[PDB]
Design a protein around this ligand. Structure first.
Ligand code: HEM
Ligand SMILES: CC1(C)[C@@H]2CC[C@@]1(C)C(=O)C2
Length: 405
């Protein structure tokens, strides 16, 4: 389904890439997206898919546009437009300066200090989950660990019942990887319907959970409104329940496939933090965009007000000009360049939490289960969207080779 080419788009800049169902998805989602970095593809293209929009394919352009909120606004960050228009999450839907006050509050609930106090619990959860799988000699990593681990830590942070996980997991998936089961606006509304009563209570009888902190916070020297709290909590939920889960699967899929890379970390664990950075670069999984606030000539290309441009955070680190042999995983890369956590004023506020969750997983897993592989005959399926993911990851190992720690 391709939309009619607009009057201002030169035919030679057209490249019909569908971010929700790329071509060589069989080669892996990152590989599927990297086709935009081929020699026969211009730096900036227009795709007639998903309503029609631009795509910046180079790290230089992606970074540039993310710094220029004057022309590239985040008020409409999702494609298709219907989604971007319904998008009202705080603080992402706001451009500076207004966005700044909310970023501070959000940092109070997911910032480093909060993660720090949670360290022992994150560790215990990783160790507990892994140890219970170890004897089995097999597991579907996505649902046996990738999902329960990060999701349980966040439900803990936000003080929400584990009984609500299934519902929230479903809603957040609808927002990042539309199943067609419901529109973004519809999934967002359901999410807000769930959140409103909770924010009301937390405001009356406030606990110590992140929702209670956001709900009774102060911004710009005045109290945050119920509406603002709701819009901020919704983003925190989507960010905390959907991203790390999928990133862990991409990483484990690779490690299950590369024994040499597993050994490297098993022998030199001090190299894990560095390994984390390289994996975050190689298996970057986010891609959203901005909307043109006015007609603008970007690198010789005429952009029109209202035009939407996809600025894939995932593509920057895969760009050959940013990192040599971008597709090769090298834990000793001295210069790991990437925009996996964003760029500009909207830099990810949950970086510390994500890194710790990834680092703790790698360390505790390779400690008890150093040797494992993908169940033979398994075909790992990837999914593309605002946040790309892995359907399932059937793993196997010989229990005689594991160590109870
Ligand atoms: C590996 C996991 C993660 C990745 C790759 C990631 C990536 C991103 C990216 C690329 C953005 C920028 C979006 C834009 O500029 O339009 C972002 C924003 C944000 N992320 Fe993360 N994120 C991750 C995990 C999390 C987690 C764990 C949370 C915590 C709940 C979170 C909370 C946020 C928030 C609140 C923002 C908004 C910041 C702002 O608009 O000023 N993220 N993230
Ligand atoms: C693009 C994102 C990854 C970022 C955090 C969650 C997300 C889906 C948003 O709506 C902002």
């Amino acid at each position: 389904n391709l939309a009619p080419l607009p009057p201002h788009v030169p035919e030679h800049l057209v490249f019909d890439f569908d971010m929700y169902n790329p071509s060589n998805l069989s080669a892996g989602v990152q590989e599927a997206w990297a086709v935009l970095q081929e020699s026969n593809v211009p730096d900036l293209v227009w795709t007639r898919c998903n309503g029609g929009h631009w795509i910046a394919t180079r790290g230089q352009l992606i970074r540039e546009a993310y710094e220029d909120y004057r022309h590239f606004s985040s008020e409409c960050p999702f494609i298709p437009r219907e989604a971007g228009e319904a998008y009202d999450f705080i603080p992402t839907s706001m451009d500076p300066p207004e966005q700044r006050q909310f970023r501070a509050l959000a940092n109070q609930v997911v910032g480093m200090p909060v993660v720090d106090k949670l360290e022992n619990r994150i560790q215990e959860l990783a160790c507990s989950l892994i140890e219970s799988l170890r004897p089995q000699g097999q597991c579907n990593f996505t649902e046996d660990y990738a999902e329960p681990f990060p999701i349980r830590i966040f439900m803990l942070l936000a003080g929400l019942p584990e009984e609500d996980i299934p519902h929230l997991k479903y809603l957040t998936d609808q927002m990042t990887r539309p199943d067609g089961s419901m529109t973004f606006a519809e999934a967002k509304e359901a999410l807000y319907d769930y959140l409103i009563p909770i924010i009301e209570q937390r405001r009356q009888k406030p606990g110590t959970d992140a929702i209670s902190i956001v709900a009774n916070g102060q911004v710009n020297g005045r109290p945050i409104t119920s509406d603002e709290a709701k819009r901020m909590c919704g983003l925190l939920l989507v960010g905390g329940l959907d991203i790390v889960v999928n990133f862990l699967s991409f990483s484990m899929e690779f490690l299950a496939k590369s024994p040499e890379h597993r050994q490297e970390l098993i022998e030199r664990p001090e190299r894990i933090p560095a390994a984390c950075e390289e994996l975050l670069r190689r298996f970057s999984l986010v891609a959203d965009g901005r909307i043109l606030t006015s007609d603008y000539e970007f690198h010789g290309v005429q952009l029109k007000k209202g035009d939407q441009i996809l600025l894939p955070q995932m593509l920057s680190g895969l760009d050959e000009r940013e990192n040599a042999c971008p597709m090769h995983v090298d834990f000793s890369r001295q210069k790991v360049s990437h925009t996996t956590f964003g760029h500009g004023s909207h830099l990810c506020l949950g970086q510390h939490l994500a890194r710790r969750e990834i680092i703790v997983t790698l360390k505790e897993w390779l400690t008890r289960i150093p040797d494992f592989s993908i169940a033979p005959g398994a075909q790992i399926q990837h999914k593309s969207g605002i946040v790309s993911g892995v359907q399932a990851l059937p793993l196997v190992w010989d229990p005689a080779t594991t160590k109870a720690v």
